[PDB]
Amino acid sequence: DGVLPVGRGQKELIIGDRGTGKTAIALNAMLAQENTDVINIFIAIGKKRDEIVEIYGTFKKHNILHKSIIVSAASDDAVAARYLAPYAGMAIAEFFQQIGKDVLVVMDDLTNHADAYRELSLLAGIAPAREA
């Protein structure tokens, strides 16, 4: 809030190693909107089902469930579903924005999304590039 400000409408990446607390930061960002008018959309790309259920329970406990949507594409879902999940989430966000709302979107995480797209492209027959 003080040293690394985030404004409404600014896309801010959260980047780091495994088990460092990135999902926790995003969840704190969504939980801080309990008393505000922002709408939360959480997109999970290739995440475990138990973690998604636990996040849903955390939403329920902190009384931010009534204005939160989770778009889930687990780690064993079809690769096309994992590729299309963020676009569907952003379409829902645009639906909410078109009527004048403020929306906060979390994508967890885009490396899995890139991996899914790479798998689709290699299977289809697209020529590989840097890092395939």
Binding site: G46, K48, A74, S75, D76, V79, N112, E119, L122, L123
Partner: peptide
């Protein structure tokens, strides 16, 4: 293989 992550998930989930 291209389907490495999907193959891991199909067993782990």
């Amino acid at each position: 293989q291209p389907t490495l992550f999907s193959e891991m998930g199909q067993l782990q989930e």
